[PDB]
From a paper:
Uropathogenic [name] strains use filamentous type 1 pili to adhere to and invade uroepithelial cells. The pilus consists of a flexible tip fibrillum, formed by the adhesin FimH and the subunits FimG and [name]. The pilus rod is a helical assembly of up to 3000 copies of the main subunit [name], terminated by a single copy of the subunit FimI that anchors the rod to the assembly platform FimD in the outer membrane. The assembly platform FimD in the outer membrane of uropathogenic [name] is the catalyst of type 1 pilus assembly.
We determined the cryo-EM structure of the transition from the last tip fibrillum subunit, [name], to the first turn of the pilus rod at 3.1 Å resolution. The structure revealed key interactions between [name] and the first three [name] subunits (FimA1, FimA2, and FimA3), which are well-resolved and clearly identifiable. In contrast, the preceding subunit of the tip fibrillum, FimG, appeared flexible and was only visible at lower thresholds, highlighting its dynamic connection to [name]. Specifically, predominantly hydrophobic interactions were found between [name] (complemented with the donor strand of FimA1) and the donor strand of FimA2, while the interfaces of [name] with FimA1 and FimA3 included both hydrophobic contacts and hydrogen bonding. Notably, superimposition of the first three [name] subunits revealed a conformational shift in the βC-βD loop: while solvent-exposed in FimA1 and FimA2, the loop in FimA3 adopts a different conformation that enables interaction with [name] through five additional hydrogen bonds. These interactions are stabilized by hydrogen bonds between Lys35 and Gln36 of [name] with backbone carbonyl oxygens of specific residues in FimA1, including Ala20, Asp60 and Val23. Importantly, the chemical identity of Lys35 and Gln36 is conserved across [name] homologs of other chaperone-usher pili at the transition from the tip fibrillum to the rod. However, Arg38 and Gln36 are shifted by a few residues when aligned to sequences of other [name] homologs, consistent with the substantially different orientation of adjacent [name] rod subunits compared to the [name]-[name] interface. Thus, these differences in the interfaces and the simultaneous interaction of [name] with FimA1, FimA2 and FimA3 are likely incompatible with a [name]-like orientation within the helical rod and thereby facilitate the transition between the linear tip fibrillum and the helical rod architecture. Models of the tip-to-rod transitions in F1C/S pili, F9 pili, P pili, and Yfc pili show that all [name] homologs point upward in a manner similar to [name]. This underlines the critical role of [name] homologs that function as adaptors aligning the tip fibrillum with the axis of the pilus rod.
Numbering used by the authors:
A (entry chain F): 13 to 154
B (entry chain A): 4 to 159
C (entry chain D), D (entry chain C), E (entry chain B), F (entry chain E), G (entry chain G): 2 to 159
The structure:
Amino acid sequence: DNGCSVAAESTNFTVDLMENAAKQFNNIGATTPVVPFRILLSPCGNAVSAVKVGFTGVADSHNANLLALENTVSAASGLGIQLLNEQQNQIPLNAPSSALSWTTLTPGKPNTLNFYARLMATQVPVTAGHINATATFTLEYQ
Amino acid sequence: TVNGGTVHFKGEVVNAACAVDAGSVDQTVQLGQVRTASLAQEGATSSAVGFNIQLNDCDTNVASKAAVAFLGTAIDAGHTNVLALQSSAAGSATNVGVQILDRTGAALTLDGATFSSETTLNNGTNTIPFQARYFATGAATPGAANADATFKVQYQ
Amino acid sequence: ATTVNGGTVHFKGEVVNAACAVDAGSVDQTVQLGQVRTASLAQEGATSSAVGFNIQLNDCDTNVASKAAVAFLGTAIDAGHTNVLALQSSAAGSATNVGVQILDRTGAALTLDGATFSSETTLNNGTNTIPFQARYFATGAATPGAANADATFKVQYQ
Amino acid sequence: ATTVNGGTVHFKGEVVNAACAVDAGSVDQTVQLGQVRTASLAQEGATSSAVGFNIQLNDCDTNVASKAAVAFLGTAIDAGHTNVLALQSSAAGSATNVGVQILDRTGAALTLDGATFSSETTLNNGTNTIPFQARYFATGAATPGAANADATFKVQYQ
Amino acid sequence: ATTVNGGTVHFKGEVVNAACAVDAGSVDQTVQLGQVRTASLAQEGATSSAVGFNIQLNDCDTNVASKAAVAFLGTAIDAGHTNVLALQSSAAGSATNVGVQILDRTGAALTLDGATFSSETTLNNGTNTIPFQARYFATGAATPGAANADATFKVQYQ
Amino acid sequence: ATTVNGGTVHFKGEVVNAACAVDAGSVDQTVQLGQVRTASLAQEGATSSAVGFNIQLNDCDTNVASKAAVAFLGTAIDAGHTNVLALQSSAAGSATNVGVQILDRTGAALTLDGATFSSETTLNNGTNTIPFQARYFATGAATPGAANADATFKVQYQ
Amino acid sequence: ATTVNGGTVHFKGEVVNAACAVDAGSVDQTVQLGQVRTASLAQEGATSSAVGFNIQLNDCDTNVASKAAVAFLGTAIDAGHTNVLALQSSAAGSATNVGVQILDRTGAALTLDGATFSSETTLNNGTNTIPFQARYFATGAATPGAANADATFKVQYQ
């Protein structure tokens, strides 16, 4: 059994990026403090060895590697959600399964995979408003 | 291959008066090295090491005062102001925790909502001073004493 | 001929919309208070001798502001002594029950909050020197150890 | 008796085939220009006063090279002003319409492209000091903020 | 009114059952050696000049231990040269046939294996300073390149 | 009205349990030895002229201690010459076969060990001054270069 | 009985293969020009009165060199005036259209390039004194402000 199961907690969860200073985005590429989030994979078998976690969704127009933000009347513009890994390395959005990075696991135990999320400015100055966004995470088992 | 699940993201970009300096957003405070003879009993504290959070592009027409609230893992119940140490492979110090003080010399409550003393702001660059000590919850044990705490700035 | 890697230089400065500008040797200075005996600081309220430092303002203009004051921000020793500055050398070997106190030209201790400005001194058209002093203040019975501190300051022109 | 893990020491240096070796204090220096008013920088081409720094070359041999020149490299503030160095934009709250300008011993500004060496200074056996200066150049009307900058220099021996 | 996420702060330290406590500025320090010439390091055994770095021990109690020694550990450049420390690899290019040699207060090189402690220094009560010196050692004919190194040290208290 | 950032001030000192307190000008002082010629230091054991520096003790209490001695600590030059200080400026351009040598009030060289104290001087109440001298000692045929050395001293009261 | 730590002493010097050694008070000296009215420096080429400073050479051997000359190096005020030193001070509140001129024994200003040497003075065994003068030079219409400057000299023996 090389396949794991996603728990009810990790089936659908919300990452709260809190309030961010519109002055923090001085230039294109300015980021924010990383906000950690975790995906609980349980139960798991005794044959699991590696999991590649990829993220899919609507990408930003200016930066193809940033998760886009819904365009409404009162939504921030010029930003994009950058999704990182455990070692704070960029995980591109809609990246091919070969471009991802394998993550080791422990067979027979509930394994928790830790990632980070932050905001990266694509335009200057960054407008104010709210940040609502949805992504779908996929798993490649090994 | 597996569809997995959906992760939602919520937040807000507000018009904050200032912006945390790129040095201050992630800083390492080298407390140094302490002796178990100094940390020998409950309530025994070591000497303090000072660190600063620097704000930039402050505007006094938006907000004239600022405060910082720290969030961390408490070492024990009843010691909410003492931050728990991280674990090391060789070993970590027991009965010791990092304690963050204020600009008034009072240790802050590491709950994420007990803000510190409000400092008035001037247009430009501002600096918020803080200090860090080692608070003993008992007879200390040798080991690496590393910790980590996050913070949020309230402009009022 | 031979071109070598050489090195690097970092320039530190600031542009201000103010009547005067703080001197390059005054924006960051080290004050050597020297060394004090534990007998001089033996009980509450005991003070040592004062070492005088000063802040220099260049390119002053009296048509914009004729008076200047300085406010200090630092970590107080505790909530009962809002004008005494705690020692922050390291995590071992610092002195206990003692802190540095800063005095303006009136010989009065200054509150370390960034909002209590000192006595306003009249300016000249040109270089102006604002004198300050720093001493040790015992909040108890001082013990041997290093006594180093650090305080930020800001200038108000009226 | 009691062995305790102390810490770590990092040694930074460079072996170079040249006539002189840059001093340990000159391979990486932090010159403090100090504060400047916006009135002095209120129009195009307005320059503040010039702080002075110098580069020291030790163990100079005049039998292999009798003259030295230093070329600085950095980020130009814009295409028009190639000799004015851009301010650190890694953080917010930086001064706009102003940069820092490096002057050789002749008093003229140096193009910061890394391939324009300054005026040649004659060398002697031993210790040599090459004087430079840094000032503020206003490419418009300056605004308040931090004015830190950075440059990396190379040395040519002839 | 406007609570904005600020960031994180990592605190690094160590509790030790020792008679002294290594200073915060000494637990991790950067010694700028400067630059050296290939002519200065032209044969085996040729050594450059030495820079000085100090290890500070705060809160020293002489009733527990009266003398202190320091033992260094790092990768050796060759098997033959056990007192010489190998340089780190650099992308631009690192110097060859040269390393870093640490000397104690007796002006003698230290074996960099973690078990050979330097000459014992008598300690007083409180702040103590142990002087050391870093020097370039040529194991052959040196070649140009960056020469960076690192060494971890432990302190023994007799 | 206009409030701007001024800068930071660092305070340095130490609280001691001693009969005297080291002066603010003596806790960290620079002695300018001047220049010497290789013709003077042309042989092993050949010394140069001596410059004088003083260590001033303030707030001395003779009831606590009537005599004071000073011991110096630093890197020696060789095993044979334990009382000759090693030069430490940078990794290039330092004088060879020569080092600074410190002399007490009896005109005798002091071992740079941290335990061999100088000749005791009787103390009176108030300000005391302890005279010392520094010269150049050549351990061979000296060669031109920069000759900078540093040392730290301890004061013993009896 | 009671041992504390005093502080630090830094020794600065240089070993030179020459006929005379620059004096300890002459290797680094401060010259107080005073202050000058802007009425005196009203147009270009206007000069102020001159203060005098001397470089003293010790331990001169007339069997090695019979004459001595001094060359100064600094940052010139502009390309037109290569013998007029540029004021440095800080980045604010410095005099405009003003520099300092250094005049040799013959009363002629010296170009500050490091290779133009002054009139040779005949040497005698022992102590020699080379006199120089310093004044202000107006490159235009002077404005109020600080007028500090720096230069480094170099001695030639023939």
